[PDB]
Every structure is written in structure tokens, then in C-alpha cells.
Design an enzyme around this catalytic site. Structure first.
Site, PDB file in Angstrom:
ATOM      1  N   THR A 192       0.804  -1.245   0.000  1.00 44.00           N
ATOM      2  CA  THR A 192       0.000   0.000   0.000  1.00 44.00           C
ATOM      3  C   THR A 192       0.821   1.271   0.000  1.00 44.00           C
ATOM      4  O   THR A 192       0.759   2.016  -0.935  1.00 44.00           O
ATOM      5  CB  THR A 192      -0.946   0.000   1.203  1.00 44.00           C
ATOM      6  OG1 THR A 192      -0.173   0.038   2.395  1.00 44.00           O
ATOM      7  CG2 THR A 192      -1.822  -1.222   1.196  1.00 44.00           C
ATOM      8  N   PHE A 245      -8.897   5.333   2.760  1.00 46.17           N
ATOM      9  CA  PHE A 245      -8.632   4.445   3.935  1.00 46.17           C
ATOM     10  C   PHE A 245      -9.891   3.734   4.393  1.00 46.17           C
ATOM     11  O   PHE A 245      -9.922   3.148   5.485  1.00 46.17           O
ATOM     12  CB  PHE A 245      -7.991   5.250   5.072  1.00 46.17           C
ATOM     13  CG  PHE A 245      -6.605   5.747   4.709  1.00 46.17           C
ATOM     14  CD1 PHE A 245      -5.512   4.910   4.650  1.00 46.17           C
ATOM     15  CD2 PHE A 245      -6.405   7.089   4.386  1.00 46.17           C
ATOM     16  CE1 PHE A 245      -4.250   5.365   4.320  1.00 46.17           C
ATOM     17  CE2 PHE A 245      -5.145   7.569   4.018  1.00 46.17           C
ATOM     18  CZ  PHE A 245      -4.068   6.697   3.971  1.00 46.17           C
ATOM     19  N   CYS A 299      -8.915   1.704   7.681  1.00 44.22           N
ATOM     20  CA  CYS A 299      -7.488   1.382   7.835  1.00 44.22           C
ATOM     21  C   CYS A 299      -7.006   1.716   9.244  1.00 44.22           C
ATOM     22  O   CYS A 299      -6.914   2.905   9.586  1.00 44.22           O
ATOM     23  CB  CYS A 299      -6.693   2.183   6.825  1.00 44.22           C
ATOM     24  SG  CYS A 299      -4.951   1.702   6.840  1.00 44.22           S
TER      25      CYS A 299
HETATM   26  C1  HEM Z   1      -1.466   4.410   1.950  1.00 47.66           C
HETATM   27  C2  HEM Z   1      -1.442   3.276   2.564  1.00 47.66           C
HETATM   28  C3  HEM Z   1      -2.664   2.503   2.878  1.00 47.66           C
HETATM   29  C4  HEM Z   1      -3.869   2.514   2.255  1.00 47.66           C
HETATM   30  C5  HEM Z   1      -4.318   3.330   1.087  1.00 47.66           C
HETATM   31  C6  HEM Z   1      -4.684   1.624   3.025  1.00 47.66           C
HETATM   32  C7  HEM Z   1      -6.033   1.405   2.745  1.00 47.66           C
HETATM   33  C8  HEM Z   1      -6.886   0.581   3.484  1.00 47.66           C
HETATM   34  C9  HEM Z   1      -8.275   0.363   3.238  1.00 47.66           C
HETATM   35  C10 HEM Z   1      -8.974   0.946   2.014  1.00 47.66           C
HETATM   36  C11 HEM Z   1      -8.783  -0.500   4.185  1.00 47.66           C
HETATM   37  C12 HEM Z   1     -10.205  -0.983   4.272  1.00 47.66           C
HETATM   38  C13 HEM Z   1     -10.371  -2.387   3.706  1.00 47.66           C
HETATM   39  C14 HEM Z   1     -11.800  -2.937   3.628  1.00 47.66           C
HETATM   40  O1  HEM Z   1     -12.735  -2.203   4.068  1.00 47.66           O
HETATM   41  O2  HEM Z   1     -11.841  -4.122   3.166  1.00 47.66           O
HETATM   42  C15 HEM Z   1      -7.664  -0.757   5.076  1.00 47.66           C
HETATM   43  C16 HEM Z   1      -7.760  -1.630   6.151  1.00 47.66           C
HETATM   44  C17 HEM Z   1      -6.632  -1.993   6.915  1.00 47.66           C
HETATM   45  N1  HEM Z   1      -5.350  -1.538   6.767  1.00 47.66           N
HETATM   46 FE1  HEM Z   1      -4.684  -0.184   5.479  1.00 47.66          FE
HETATM   47  N2  HEM Z   1      -3.933   1.033   3.967  1.00 47.66           N
HETATM   48  C18 HEM Z   1      -2.711   1.562   3.962  1.00 47.66           C
HETATM   49  C19 HEM Z   1      -1.660   1.242   4.816  1.00 47.66           C
HETATM   50  C20 HEM Z   1      -1.684   0.338   5.822  1.00 47.66           C
HETATM   51  C21 HEM Z   1      -0.601   0.043   6.692  1.00 47.66           C
HETATM   52  C22 HEM Z   1       0.782   0.621   6.562  1.00 47.66           C
HETATM   53  C23 HEM Z   1      -1.060  -0.906   7.614  1.00 47.66           C
HETATM   54  C24 HEM Z   1      -0.345  -1.564   8.686  1.00 47.66           C
HETATM   55  C25 HEM Z   1       0.917  -1.462   8.958  1.00 47.66           C
HETATM   56  C26 HEM Z   1      -2.425  -1.156   7.283  1.00 47.66           C
HETATM   57  C27 HEM Z   1      -3.254  -2.002   7.998  1.00 47.66           C
HETATM   58  C28 HEM Z   1      -4.609  -2.179   7.745  1.00 47.66           C
HETATM   59  C29 HEM Z   1      -5.463  -3.102   8.515  1.00 47.66           C
HETATM   60  C30 HEM Z   1      -5.024  -4.010   9.624  1.00 47.66           C
HETATM   61  C31 HEM Z   1      -6.710  -2.925   8.057  1.00 47.66           C
HETATM   62  C32 HEM Z   1      -7.960  -3.637   8.575  1.00 47.66           C
HETATM   63  C33 HEM Z   1      -8.567  -2.712   9.621  1.00 47.66           C
HETATM   64  C34 HEM Z   1      -9.799  -3.290  10.296  1.00 47.66           C
HETATM   65  O3  HEM Z   1     -10.747  -3.756   9.597  1.00 47.66           O
HETATM   66  O4  HEM Z   1      -9.793  -3.423  11.543  1.00 47.66           O
HETATM   67  N3  HEM Z   1      -2.781  -0.332   6.267  1.00 47.66           N
HETATM   68  N4  HEM Z   1      -6.520  -0.092   4.581  1.00 47.66           N
END
Ligand code: HEM
Ligand code: HL0
Length: 454
Positions: free
Chosen positions: A267, A392, A399
Site C-alpha cells: 500500500t 482508507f 485502515c
Molecule cells: C497508503 C497506505 C494505505 C492505504 C491506502 C490503506 C487502505 C486501506 C483500506 C482501504 C482499508 C479498508 C479495507 C476494507 O474495508 O476491506 C484498510 C484496512 C486496513 N489496513 Fe490499510 N492502507 C494503507 C496502509 C496500511 C498500513 C501501513 C497498515 C499496517 C501497517 C495497514 C493495515 C490495515 C489493517 C489491519 C486494516 C484492517 C482494519 C480493520 O478492519 O480493523 N494499512 N486499509
């Protein structure tokens, strides 16, 4: 009550062959452009409704009516990410447990603690580029992925992937990338039991073993030492959910680590790569961002406070997420029978997919110039309507890594703009490769050092 549009069909395979492409999100964006704010997509096994307008996505984001769904791809990613935060259902005990334990570790306040090891990796990137010879160029998404993987490794579990010391990926990463590729490919298959997929299935089981073995050993080695590092793994071994009173077990800690490594690899690296693409294509924007970096980053090593001061660099990152949100979709399900937008009746359990790149091109929200790269859209951020900008995700299933990703991206982009001039020496033609995420494939630049010491 309206009938929803549906793209072209392939007899008994219905719409499924439309996903038989290396670029399925870009194909769905062109279908959205033709059909409008909502379309139905039918496969032998399942139905999705794809949403593109702020009008309908704002309703889909109402957590009293709709909850996070696992798409077919996330159900297959769950074969290795298990009931980690990203591949758990909101109703599973382990989701809220892990959410409550890990939220404080991902706060803006927590970023002060990760800053020094983010700088460790960022300095390795700057030193790599300072050491290139005159005739050489940078492979952008390749080096951004080395950076972002290494940052989450080090901040996450004090493990150095040492990506800047390698051409060939770490064996853990070979297996993770191949497991992700198999998960993304399985749904477009009409006969998944065909014997031609037997070697794929055998390779998938092997890759899951490689991942479980390194991560299970990392956990077991930290439990044996008693070492109390400033990292997510220390937080997960020691933490107790305030609600249940329970700690995470070691299996669920493994699934969280696998999840964070997938995120770090896929990401933030895409965001940084698209941001540098838009900067070299828009040199007036590059100069505003470079001027801010020069004015703000007055020390050899950036401080946490200095990164927070890079407002224009943050606006550049948000405008890159608007045009190419590197995680481009998320799925929801209807909690009960309901009517979307006063026109589209849904049954309990009906699945929706939000096309974030299309939401971010809604001309009713952003104006007619949606394709233009203009960071100033984000100068006065309260001006953006509710639910218009969702790179996000949404609500309690947004996220968890948002503040981590933006701190790292702002730090690194600020340091890149302080230390180097950039040239689009090939006049690169955007080519977007799709994995779990979007990245600009083949994007290369030349850097010219400003000769500013670290
Ligand atoms: C620009 C960077 C990032 C973008 C654009 C991004 C985007 C997203 C999005 C769109 C979701 C929602 C997914 C869904 O609803 O199915 C999400 C969930 C998540 N992201 Fe990110 N992400 C990024 C970076 C990261 C990083 C660096 C980490 C961890 C080190 C991370 C950990 C997570 C986790 C664990 C979730 C699940 C959260 C939950 O449902 O409790 N993300 N992200
Ligand atoms: C966090 C970003 C996740 C990336 C998902 C983007 C994939 C787009 C292709 C798509 O809609 N496939 C559907 C079809 C059935 O099952 C799926 O999953």
C-alpha cells in the site's frame, strides 16, 4: 424503483470473464464510466453491485445499514491472513479484541515512537540514491517497496528484511507475493477443481508454510528472550483487550503480523510511487513541495515535529490518493432488507463493492476537472463533503494503519524532495499493475543530488 444496469455477459459464465484480466479494477472503472453510479455484476457463484457515486456510497457507509464484507479475494487471502484485522468479520470476537488492543499502537501519538526507525529506513533510501552513478536511473515502485516493507518489518517486530541489500526478494516475500497472486486469480476461474490448477494449489500450501514458519519463529524467539522492544509484537504479547480482558493468542498474533507485512509491501509503496509520478508530471507542484521540504527540514535528520509541519507534502499525498487510491475497493453487505438511493432494493446479505477511484472522480463533488492533479483541493480540508474521499475505507473498519502510512510517506517524500532534483527522463507512460493494490509499473526517474549532507 429502478432496474440496475449490467455489463456484457458470456452465456452461462454471466459477467465473470470480465475479470479475466491482469487489470480488473481498471476494467471495472471503464464499465462504471459507461454504466454510471451503480451496476450489477453476476457470476455463477455470486452477485456484486458496484458503486461509484458519492450519493450512493454515503448511504453504503452508514454502519447501521451496511457492514464490511469479505469479497471472494479477501476470503482467499484469509487462507494465510486468517482472522487478522483485515480478513475478519466485524462480528468475530477476534476482530474487536485485536482492534481494541492495537488502536493505541497506531495512534498519531504512537508515531512519535516509530519515527526513529522510519528515519533509519528513509536514510537508507536517500543513501542508495546519493550513491548512484551519473548514467543510472531509479526503479521507483521497486525502491518504494523496499522502503515500506523494511519500515513495517522494523517498526512492527524489530526484523530487518534488509531490502536495500538485495535484488532477489527475501524468501518470505517470494511466498507472500505468490500467495497473494494465487488468491487474486482463484475467483476468475470458472472450473476451480480442473486438474490444471493442481500445481497452483500445491504451491499455495507451500507458500502458506514458509510464511507461518518465519512468523511463528519470530513470535517464539521474542517470547523466549523476554526482550521489551518498542514494537507492535511487544504490544501484542503484553496487551489485554479492555473489553474481554483477553490477550491475543500466538496464532492470531501471527495473522496480524502477516497482515501488516502485506500492507507495508503493497500500500504505502504504491502511494509514494504515484506521488512521485504526479510530481514529475506537474513540475510547478514539484517546486512547491521541494520549497516546503527545504524550508521545513532544516536538520540533517527530520524530527517528528518537522514531518507534521509538511502541510503541502501531505496535500500532494492526498491528491495522489484521490486519483489512484492504491487500495482501490472495499466491500459491504446489507445488514437487513433496505432500499439504496430510494431506487435500488437490496435483500439482507446483498454484497456491494465501492470503486474508490470512481468515487474520487465524481464530478458532482469535485467539479469537471477531476483528472487534473491539484493538491490545493486539500488546502481547506473541511470543504470536502462527508464520504467523498475514502482512500482508507470507512468507519470502524477503516485502515488502522492510516497515521503510520501517512507519517512514513510524508517523511520519505519530504526527504526525497529535500535531497534530489528529479527528471522524467523517459517521458514515462503510466502503466498501472494490479495486485492487492495499484502501482505504476516500469516507472523510472533520474535523480540529481542537491549535495545536502545527512
Ligand atoms: C497508503 C497506505 C494505505 C492505504 C491506502 C490503506 C487502505 C486501506 C483500506 C482501504 C482499508 C479498508 C479495507 C476494507 O474495508 O476491506 C484498510 C484496512 C486496513 N489496513 Fe490499510 N492502507 C494503507 C496502509 C496500511 C498500513 C501501513 C497498515 C499496517 C501497517 C495497514 C493495515 C490495515 C489493517 C489491519 C486494516 C484492517 C482494519 C480493520 O478492519 O480493523 N494499512 N486499509
Ligand atoms: C483493499 C483492496 C482490495 C483489492 C480488491 C480489488 C479487486 C477488484 C476485482 C474485484 O472486484 N473482484 C471481486 C469479484 C469477486 O470477488 C472479488 O473480490
Amino acid at each position: 424503483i429502478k432496474e440496475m444496469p449490467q455489463p456484457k455477459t458470456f452465456g452461462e459464465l454471466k459477467n465473470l470473464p470480465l475479470l479475466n484480466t491482469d487489470k480488473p479494477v481498471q476494467a471495472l472503472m471503464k464499465i462504471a464510466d459507461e454504466l454510471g453510479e451503480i451496476f450489477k455484476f453476476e457470476a455463477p457463484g455470486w452477485v456484486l453491485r458496484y458503486l461509484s457515486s458519492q450519493r450512493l456510497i454515503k448511504e453504503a457507509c452508514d454502519e447501521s445499514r451496511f457492514d464490511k464484507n469479505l469479497s471472494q479475494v479477501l476470503k482467499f487471502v484469509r487462507d494465510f491472513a486468517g482472522d487478522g484485522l483485515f480478513t475478519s468479520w466485524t462480528h468475530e470476537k477476534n476482530w474487536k479484541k485485536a482492534h481494541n488492543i492495537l488502536l493505541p499502537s497506531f495512534s498519531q501519538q504512537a508515531m512519535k515512537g516509530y519515527h526513529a526507525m522510519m528515519v533509519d529506513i528513509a536514510v537508507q533510501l536517500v543513501q542508495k540514491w546519493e550513491r548512484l552513478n551519473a548514467d543510472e536511473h531509479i526503479e521507483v515502485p521497486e525502491d518504494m517497496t523496499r522502503l515500506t516493507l523494511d519500515t513495517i518489518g522494523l517498526c512492527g517486530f524489530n526484523y530487518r528484511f534488509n531490502s536495500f541489500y538485495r535484488d532477489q526478494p527475501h524468501p518470505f516475500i517470494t511466498s507472500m507475493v505468490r500467495a497473494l497472486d494465487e488468491a487474486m486469480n482463484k475467483p476468475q476461474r470458472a472450473n476451480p477443481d480442473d486438474p490444471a490448477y493442481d500445481e497452483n494449489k500445491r504451491q499455495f500450501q507451500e507458500d502458506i508454510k514458509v510464511m507461518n514458519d518465519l512468523v511463528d519463529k519470530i513470535i517464539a524467539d521474542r517470547k523466549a528472550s523476554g526482550e521489551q522492544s518498542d514494537d507492535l509484537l511487544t504490544h501484542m504479547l503484553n496487551g489485554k483487550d479492555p473489553e474481554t480482558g483477553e490477550p491475543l493468542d500466538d496464532e492470531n498474533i501471527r495473522y496480524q503480523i502477516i497482515t501488516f507485512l502485506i500492507a507495508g509491501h503493497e500500500t504505502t509503496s504504491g502511494l509514494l510511487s504515484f506521488a512521485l509520478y504526479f510530481l514529475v508530471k506537474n513540475p510547478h507542484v514539484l517546486q512547491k513541495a521541494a520549497e516546503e521540504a527545504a524550508r521545513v527540514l532544516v536538520d540533517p535528520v527530520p524530527s517528528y515535529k518537522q514531518v507534521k509541519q509538511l502541510k503541502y507534502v501531505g496535500m500532494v499525498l492526498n491528491e495522489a490518493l484521490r486519483l489512484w487510491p492504491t487500495a482501490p475497493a472495499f466491500s459491504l453487505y446489507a445488514k437487513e432488507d433496505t432500499v439504496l438511493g430510494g431506487e435500488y432494493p437490496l435483500e439482507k446479505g446483498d454484497e456491494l463493492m465501492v470503486l474508490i477511484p470512481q468515487l474520487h472522480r465524481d464530478k458532482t463533488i469535485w467539479g469537471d476537472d477531476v483528472e487534473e492533479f491539484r493538491p490545493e483541493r486539500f488546502e481547506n480540508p473541511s470543504a470536502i463533503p462527508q464520504h467523498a474521499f475514502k482512500p482508507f475505507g470507512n468507519g470502524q473498519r477503516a485502515c488502522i494503519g492510516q497515521q503510520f502510512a501517512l507519517h512514513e510517506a510524508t517523511l520519505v517524500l519530504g526527504m526525497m524532495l529535500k535531497h534530489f532534483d528529479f527528471e522524467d527522463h523517459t517521458n514515462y507512460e503510466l502503466d498501472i499493475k494490479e495486485t492487492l493494490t495499484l502501482k505504476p509499473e516500469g516507472f523510472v526517474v533520474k535523480a540529481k543530488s542537491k549535495k545536502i549532507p545527512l
